[PDB]
RNA sequence: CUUGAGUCUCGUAGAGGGGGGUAGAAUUCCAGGUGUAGCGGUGAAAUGCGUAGAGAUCUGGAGGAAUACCGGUGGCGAAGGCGGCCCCCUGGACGAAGACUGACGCUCAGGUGCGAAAGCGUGGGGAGCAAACAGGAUUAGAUACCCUGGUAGUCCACGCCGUAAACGAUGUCGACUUGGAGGUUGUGCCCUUGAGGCGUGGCUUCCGGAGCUAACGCGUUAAGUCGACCGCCUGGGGAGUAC
């Protein structure tokens, strides 16, 4: 049926997690090393835009203590 | 940027009674309300120069459509500038 | 720069490949070196720049089939 | 300084676990064994191996620094280990082998080498 | 009107302050004809890092719509609220009022990982069970 | 008149501008804990710090520049220029339907506004690093280089002449010229068969054809074919000084 838009096996082999929502802790740790910082868009194969917005939403999240800012907090 | 209801008030009072935005008197009156709000902001915020560039744009297109209007009808022109309380 | 991300199965030799994702690069690499403001945008961000030698190689593969070197 | 002591048997507090700290520079390694709560139980260095130059700052001098200190603390009675690593210099892995060779487990190799939020400006050095 | 999604947490022991603060924050927003489209409390959570000491805090998503002048007075209040340790409010572009990503984790926190204490009962008096002054 | 351009509401991508809020990490600092003989620097080395207890290390607070991360061929500005996250005021550009005006156009001497960088007056701020300065090291000479000590400075706010290699050293805006594809986004269509495919706009980029170059190179974002108008150059040295 028409306008299905991500039924199956289309856009990406690897799934996109969030954009600008920032309220779940487990979705954000998808892009955080143990050194405590956001991963480049070449490694994940995000299109750059979706990453520039996430970069703000994760930083916003970090500053609210959902996430570690530094390796020293492991 | 202007409020929806300010944009409808300009259209009611200026141009013809068709309530278009397209015409030379009403484009001059729609620019005008935005120049006047920006000169409100710029009562303070005195280091904000790269946006002040935007005032000199809004002003300059208004100088071009009042230049056009005065090559045409003197009634529309002399009525507008005093009815719209414009310049000094 | 043994890098804080833990190596799959711990051993005396750190698995430096499996560890880094964006650590040390640009931040702790230019140690005892002069800091520039805007040069890093074109100086360090060289991911397109390094792909070209791989592309050149992937092009010459095809030509070796057409020449009968392959 | 050191004394000529008879063969060692001695007991101190038999604490069983520790943290090690490895402070790696360009000219040296400082290798320092602590209690988990964080108190020096002893240290050794690469520079007292008296190589001079660049040669003091090689993985084999990093190894033997680790082996002196890990040894001395057998009187403190440590049996398991963890390490924090703090510098970009060499002995990445060969220091880790000497802590294991002291007969300790060394499963947690946490690099903590601090990345300030763009901190204090470094000496300019060579004009390239 | 424009929508501003406020999320904040409070130092456990200081939570007894907030049931007084929320009833004012709602009286200034519905006093400006705004709306609260949920106001969900998630319960007490582990911080990744301490803020003003302690490794725990209690997390609240207020989910406001308000005209812009009122939100401007509210971020300054909430940032300088002494009981609040930190707070974030996000931009209008692509903003949600439904189907929360933390719906399970909220239930897990409230059910199990919580404080279980009197100082977070007060927090729940600021939570979904919101009580607010009359306009 | 629309075939040029201009305007209203809708949508979109981004570190554009100006004022507010806000956390944590190293050096640096105060206090307390633990602890013994070197640390630092480099070709190698000395000056430097240390038994008056250094060096390293742990705990808690402190302060300020700064914000490590968006990091990619991305996006924005004015070239130079812009990167923590939020809020307030707000510019400029990219799309799309409905709709309106109807050459309202191009260029711009003069012109007023506006700084990469340091320079800089008062206020604020000051942690490290550093020209000079000092001494070691070189003999290789200038206190330079190189190393250690070490100050103005760097940092913010407002303010003064806006400097350069001032940038795609490619003026402005507009018309015309085989295209495919990357990056990635409005939006029409698709099981969105893979940062995928086609319709049609968007900046941004790889390849190469017509044309253009001394040569590299450019090539639909020209350095092509052109349009008007403005800006600037006319052998070296001596002069970015002199007048």
From Swiss-Prot, chain B:
* SMART domains, per database record: Ribosomal_S15 (SM01387)
Q: Does the keyword Membrane apply?
A: no
Q: Tell me one GO biological process term.
A: translation
The molecular function terms in GO held by this entry are: rRNA binding; structural constituent of ribosome
Q: What's in the GO CC field?
A: cytosolic small ribosomal subunit
Q: Kindly give the InterPro entries that the UniProt entry links to this protein.
A: Ribosomal_uS15 (IPR000589), Ribosomal_uS15_bac-type (IPR005290), uS15_NS1_RNA-bd_sf (IPR009068)
Under the heading CDD domains, the entry gives: Ribosomal_S15p_S13e
Similarity annotation: Belongs to the universal ribosomal protein uS15 family.
Summary of subunit composition and partner proteins: Part of the 30S ribosomal subunit. Forms a bridge to the 50S subunit in the 70S ribosome, contacting the 23S rRNA.
Name it.
Small ribosomal subunit protein uS15
Swiss-Prot record, chain C:
Entry keywords, A to Z: Ribonucleoprotein, Ribosomal protein, RNA-binding, rRNA-binding
**Entry-linked InterPro entries:** Ribosomal_bS21, Ribosomal_bS21_CS, Ribosomal_bS21_sf
- Is Transcription regulation included in the keywords of this UniProt record? no
Q: Does the keyword Ion transport apply?
A: no
Recorded source organism is Escherichia coli (strain K12)
What GO terms in the biological process aspect are recorded for it? cytoplasmic translation; ribosomal small subunit assembly
Designated name of the protein: Small ribosomal subunit protein bS21
Q: Where is the composition biased (Basic and acidic residues)?
A: 59-70
Give a Gene Ontology cellular component term annotated to this protein: cytosol
Question: Which residue stretches belong to region Disordered?
Answer: 42-70
Subunit notes for this chain? Part of the 30S ribosomal subunit. In stalled ribosomes contacts ribosome rescue factor SmrB.
| Gene name for this UniProt entry | rpsU
Q: List the disulfide bonds.
A: none
A GO molecular-function descriptor: structural constituent of ribosome
Swiss-Prot record, chain D:
Q: Which UniProt keywords apply?
A: Methylation, Ribonucleoprotein, Ribosomal protein, RNA-binding, rRNA-binding
Q: Which GO terms describe its biological process?
A: cytoplasmic translation; translation
* Signal sequence, renumbered to the chain: none
In this UniProt entry, the residues modified to N-methylalanine are 1
Entry's Gene Ontology cellular component terms: cytoplasm; cytosol; cytosolic small ribosomal subunit
Query: Gene3D superfamilies of this UniProt entry?
Result: Ribosomal protein S11
Indicate yes or no for the key word Transmembrane: no
Question: Which GO MF term does the entry hold, naming one?
Answer: small ribosomal subunit rRNA binding
Q: State whether keyword Heme applies.
A: no
Q: Which Pfam family would be a valid example here? A: Ribosomal_S11
Mention any additional remark. Has been predicted to contact the N-terminal domain of IF-3 based on footprint studies; exactly how IF-3 interacts with the 30S subunit is controversial.
Cross-referenced HAMAP family: Ribosomal_uS11 (MF_01310)
NCBIfam families per the UniProt record, alphabetical: PRK05309.1, uS11_bact
Recorded family membership: Belongs to the universal ribosomal protein uS11 family.
The job of this chain, per UniProt, is described as: Located on the platform of the 30S subunit, it bridges several disparate RNA helices of the 16S rRNA. Forms part of the Shine-Dalgarno cleft in the 70S ribosome.
Record note on quaternary structure: Part of the 30S ribosomal subunit. Interacts with proteins uS7 and bS18. Cross-links to IF-3. In stalled ribosomes contacts ribosome rescue factor SmrB.
Put simply, this protein is called Small ribosomal subunit protein uS11
- The organism named in the record is Escherichia coli (strain K12)
Swiss-Prot record, chain E:
Query: What cellular-component terms does GO give this entry?
Result: cytoplasm; cytosol; cytosolic small ribosomal subunit
What name is this protein filed under? Small ribosomal subunit protein bS6
Q: Where is the composition biased (Basic and acidic residues)?
A: 104-116
Q: What does its PTM field state?
A: 5 different forms of the protein, varying only in the number of C-terminal glutamate residues, were isolated. The sequence shown is form bS6-6, which is the longest. The first two Glu are encoded by the rpsF gene, the other Glu are added post-translationally by the RimK enzyme.
Output the Pfam families linked to this UniProt entry.
Answer: Ribosomal_S6
Q: Which InterPro entries match?
A: Ribosomal_bS6, Ribosomal_bS6_CS, Ribosomal_bS6_sf, Ribosomal_S6_plastid/chlpt, Transl_elong_EF1B/ribsomal_bS6
Q: Does the keyword Magnesium apply?
A: no
Which family would the database say this protein is a member of?
Belongs to the bacterial ribosomal protein bS6 family.
Q: Which NCBIfam families match?
A: S6
Tell me the function of this protein: Binds together with bS18 to 16S ribosomal RNA.
One of its GO biological process terms is: cytoplasmic translation
The record's listing under CDD domains reads: bS6 (cd00473)
Q: Which UniProt keywords apply?
A: Acetylation, Ribonucleoprotein, Ribosomal protein, RNA-binding, rRNA-binding
Biased composition regions of type Acidic residues, renumbered to the chain: 120-135
GO MF annotations in UniProt: mRNA 5'-UTR binding; small ribosomal subunit rRNA binding; structural constituent of ribosome
Residues recorded as bearing N6-acetyllysine in the entry: 93
Q: Quick one: where's region Disordered?
A: 98-135
Instruction: Summarize subunit and interaction data from the UniProt record for this chain.
Output: Part of the 30S ribosomal subunit. Interacts weakly with uL2 in one of the 3.5 A resolved structures.
């Amino acid at each position: 049926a028409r306008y299905f838009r991500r039924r199956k096996f289309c856009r990406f082999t690897a799934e996109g997690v969030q954009e600008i929502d920032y309220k779940d802790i487990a979705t954000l740790k998808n892009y955080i090393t143990e050194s405590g910082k956001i991963v480049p868009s070449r490694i994940t194969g995000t299109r750059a835009k979706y990453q520039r917005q996430l970069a703000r939403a994760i930083k916003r999240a970090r500053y609210l203590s959902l996430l570690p800012y530094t390796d020293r907090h492991q | 940027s202007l409020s929806t209801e300010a944009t409808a008030k300009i259209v009611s009072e200026f141009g013809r009674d068709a309530n278009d935005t397209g015409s030379t008197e009403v484009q001059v009156a729609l620019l005008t309300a935005q120049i006047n709000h920006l000169q409100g902001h710029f009562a303070e915020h005195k280091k904000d120069h790269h946006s002040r560039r935007g005032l000199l744009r809004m002003v300059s297109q208004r100088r071009k459509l009042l230049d056009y209007l005065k090559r045409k009808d003197v009634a529309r022109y002399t009525r507008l500038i005093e009815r719209l309380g414009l310049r000094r | 720069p043994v890098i804080k991300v833990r190596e799959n199965e711990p051993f005396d030799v750190a698995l430096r490949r499996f560890k880094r994702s964006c650590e040390k690069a640009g931040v702790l690499a230019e140690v005892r070196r002069r800091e520039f403001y805007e040069k890093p945008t074109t100086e360090r961000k060289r991911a397109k720049a390094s792909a070209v030698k791989r592309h050149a190689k992937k092009l010459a593969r095809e030509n070796a089939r057409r020449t009968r070197l392959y | 300084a050191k004394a000529p002591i008879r063969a060692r048997k001695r007991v101190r507090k038999q604490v069983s676990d520790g943290v090690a700290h490895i402070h790696a520079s360009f000219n040296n390694t400082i290798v320092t064994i602590t209690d988990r709560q964080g108190n020096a139980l002893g240290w050794a260095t690469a520079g007292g191996s008296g190589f001079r130059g660049s040669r003091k700052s090689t993985p084999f001098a990093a190894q033997v620094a680790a082996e002196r200190c890990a040894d001395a603390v057998k009187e403190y009675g440590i049996k398991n280990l963890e390490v924090m690593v703090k510098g970009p210099g060499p002995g990445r892995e060969s220091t880790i082998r000497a802590l294991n060779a002291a007969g300790f487990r060394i499963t947690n190799i946490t690099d903590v080498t601090p990345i300030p939020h763009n901190g204090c400006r470094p000496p300019k050095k060579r004009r390239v | 009107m424009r929508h501003y999604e406020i999320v904040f947490m409070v130092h456990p022991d200081q939570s007894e302050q907030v049931p007084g603060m929320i009833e004012r924050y709602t009286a200034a927003i519905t006093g400006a004809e705004g709306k609260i489209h949920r106001l969900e409390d998630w319960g007490r959570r582990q911080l990744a890092y301490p803020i003003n000491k302690l490794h725990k805090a209690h997390y609240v998503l207020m989910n406001v719509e308000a005209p812009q002048e009122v939100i401007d007075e509210l971020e300054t209040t909430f940032r300088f609220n002494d009981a609040v340790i930190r707070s974030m409010v996000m931009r209008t572009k692509h903003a949600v009022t439904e189907a929360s990503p933390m719906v399970k984790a909220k239930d897990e926190r409230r059910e199990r990982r919580d404080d279980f204490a009197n100082e977070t009962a007060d927090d729940a008096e600021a939570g979904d069970s919101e009580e607010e002054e009359e306009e």
